């Protein structure tokens, strides 16, 4: 953690302390115990052919200027019809009020496993994701200490959720291999230059032994790329930017799955 | 489809925010605000040197929302960039999703004597008067998104207010649009919009299509002295840096390193 991400962390700490005040762990521990019971995310992620995780940003970039209001429930449903193996919801709760409600509306609308994409630095946030209906969380191996990585993985496992461990480089990969993570996502982003490139998963995928399920995220927008990743042993891919920019996102899901 | 999905949603939010701002601050009030401000400095002149010039860019927002102790202070950051040798300061304002992003541009403007470029998303003449009332000496115009009439209308409004208008180009079609509009100042954006992939290939591929006499800026994926020297060798007159300055431990030393100078 250093730079703009350091400034984000600083804000996250404030927000988390404020939330703990209003809803202490004990109250949230109970809430999570009574949420929709967790589906098996990792299982959805491995069949004969590479699987699609379709990601929704939990926020209306139009901020209400589009009428008929932003409706992620209907969006997720159309992704599910189009063959998506799982839905991802990028929540931005620390910067927008109702973001987490969008995660709940998606959870109610689909039968697929739901991955919550946010920035987890505290055990209290794993409980929050469970209480909102998530079946999986993300963990940033470049950010967390090797102790917190294992503690957060184990607590997710304790609550019934899968934890996908993000890696960006060779040093992140060894840390995830050290924490014995059975589920890794390669983020195709140079964290220094903010350069997106498929070359990251191409170089790094081979440093992950067979047995661990590999997911790839970033720079995928053609069916050619999807077949290339499937040739690489990659069991699933996440798409977010390609969907947000398609004139018909569900049609892009079908194109990416070759349907 | 050029304007689809998320970009359509942003523009739609902009259109609505501009209409609301217009009703609270009408054109004749804002025109007098612009006319009241100290006059814009010459931004084009700051970019014509014998060496390539650095436009050092600051984001006009606090991602910590106040949690960072010592509070975010862009005035002092801009002063450090000026001291280190920048030719101009760019301020990225996000006034359509954060409230007082424009107050940071005013803080920067009071703090330096360099020309100040306002980096934001201009689609309406109202926003050109706004940038001038906030102290801007230059604006950006995205040629790929404006109609030819709109592009020419916004360039002429900027000129009539004494500001420079930097026309952004992303590909060969954009360049021809800019040259057809007789733009004196063009910035090549080093970004494949399709993938959100950043690369200097764009500037290399498009620089020869722009005749001498037109001032060329390059923006995106610049972070080493060798890249700066290569662009200078291409006759590029200025470069914008934002990302590399924020990741830098000492941002003022990085400015000096990109210019190849000491103190």
HEC letters along chain B? CCCCHHHHHHHHHHHHHHHHHHHHCCHHHHHHHHHHCCCCCCHHHHCCCCCCEEEEEEEECCCCCCCCCCCCCHHHHHHHHHHHCCCEEEEEECCCCCCCHHHHHHHHHHHCCCCEEEECCCCCHHHHHHHHHCCCCEEEEECCCCCHHHHHHHHHHHHHCCCEEEEEECCHHHHHHHHHCCCCEEEEECEECCCCEECCHHHHHHHHHCCCCCEEEEECCCCCHHHHHHHHHCCCCEEEECHHHHHCCCHHHHHHHHHCCCC
Distance from CA of A241 to the nearest CA of B (A): 8
**Range B5-259: architecture per CATH:** Alpha-Beta Barrel (3.20)
What CA–CA distance (Å, rounded) separates B72 from B66? 7
H/E stretch holding A239: strand A236-239
Of B4, B13, B63, the CB nearest to A65: B13
CATH code, residues A4-256:
3.20.20.70
Label residues B217-250 b or e (16+ Cβ within 10 Å = b): bbbbbbbeeebbebbbeeebbbbbbbbbbbbbee
- Report the residue of chain B nearest A246, measured CA to CA: B5
Burial B114-148 (b: 16+ CB within 10 A, else e): bbbbbbbbbbbebbbbbbbbbbbbbbbbbbebbee
**What CA–CA distance (Å, rounded) separates B240 from B243?**
10
Alpha carbon distance A8, A11 (integer Å): 5
Distance (Å) of CA B5 to CA A131, A247, B18, B177: 31, 6, 20, 24
Q: How long is chain B?
A: 263
Identify all chain B residues contacting A13, using CB atoms and an 8 Å cutoff: 67
How many other CB atoms are there within 10 angstroms of residue B30's CB atom?
A: 17
Residues in chain A whose beta carbon is closer than 8 A to a beta carbon of chain B?
Answer: 3-4, 7-8, 10-11, 13-14, 60-66, 95, 192-197, 219, 221, 241, 244-247, 249
Sole residue written with tokens 């799955």: A257
| Rounded Cα gap, residues B245 and B59, in angstroms | 11
- Please report the resolution in angstroms: 2.1
Q: What letter does residue A245 receive in the DSSP assignment?
A: T
B/e letters for A69-92, b = 16+ CB within 10 Å, e = fewer, are ebebbebbbbbbebbbbbbbbbbe
Distance CA B151, CA B173 (A): 14
Angle at B101 between CA A1 and CA B256, to 5 degrees: 55
The torsion angles phi and psi of B127, rounded to 5 degrees, stand at -70, -20
Q: How many angstroms separate the CA of residue B151 from the nearest CA in chain A?
A: 24
Residue A160 — φ and ψ, nearest 5°?
100, 0
CB contact under 8 A, B6 and A246: no
**Do B195 and B72 meet the contact criterion of CB atoms below 8 Å apart?**
no
CB contact under 8 A, B197 and A197: yes
Q: If we measure between CA atoms, which residue out of B7, B3, B31 comes closest to residue B125?
A: B31
Shortest alpha-carbon distance between residue B161 and chain A (Å): 31
Report phi then psi at A233, rounded to 5: 90, 10
Query: For A90, left (φ over 0), alpha (ψ -120 to 50), or beta?
Result: beta
Determine, for residues B62 and A194 on separate chains, whether the beta-carbon distance falls below 8 Å: no
CB A47 within 8 A of CB A79: no
Which residue, among B102, B114, B110, has the nearest Cα to B61 in the 3D structure? B102
* Element holding A237 (H helix, E strand): strand A236-239
Angle at B63 between CA B140 and CA B33, to 5 degrees: 45
Burial class (CB in 10 A: 0-12, 13-18, 19+), B17: middle
Contacts of A14 in chain B (CB under 8 A): 65-67
């Amino acid at each position: 953690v250093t730079g703009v991400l350091r400034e984000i962390v600083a804000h996250l700490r404030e927000e988390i302390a404020e939330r703990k005040r209003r809803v202490p762990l004990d109250e949230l521990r109970a809430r999570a115990a009574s949420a929709p019971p967790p589906l098996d995310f990792l299982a959805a992620l491995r069949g004969p052919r590479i699987r699609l995780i379709a990601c929704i940003v939990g926020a209306d970039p139009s901020v209400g200027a589009i009428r008929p209001e932003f409706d992620p429930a209907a969006i997720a449903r159309s992704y599910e019809k189009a063959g998506a193996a799982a839905i991802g919801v990028f929540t931005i709760e620390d910067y927008f009020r109702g973001s987490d409600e969008y995660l709940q509306q998606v959870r109610a609308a689909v039968s697929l496993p739901v991955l919550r994409i946010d920035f987890i630095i505290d055990p209290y946030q794993v409980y929050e994701a469970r209480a909102l209906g998530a079946d999986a969380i993300l963990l940033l191996a470049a950010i967390l200490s090797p102790a917190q990585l294992r503690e957060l993985m184990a607590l997710a496992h304790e609550l019934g959720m899968a934890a996908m461990v993000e890696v960006t480089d060779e040093e992140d990969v060894e840390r995830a291999l050290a924490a014995k993570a059975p589920l890794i996502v390669i983020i195709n982003l140079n964290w220094d230059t903010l350069e997106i490139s498929l070359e990251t998963t191409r170089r790094l995928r081979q440093r992950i032994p067979p047995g661990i399920t590999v997911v790839t995220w970033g720079g995928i927008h053609t069916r050619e790329q999807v077949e290339e990743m499937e040739k690489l042993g990659v069991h699933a891919f996440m798409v977010m930017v390609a969907l947000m920019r398609a004139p018909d996102p569900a049609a892009k899901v079908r194109e990416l799955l070759g349907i």
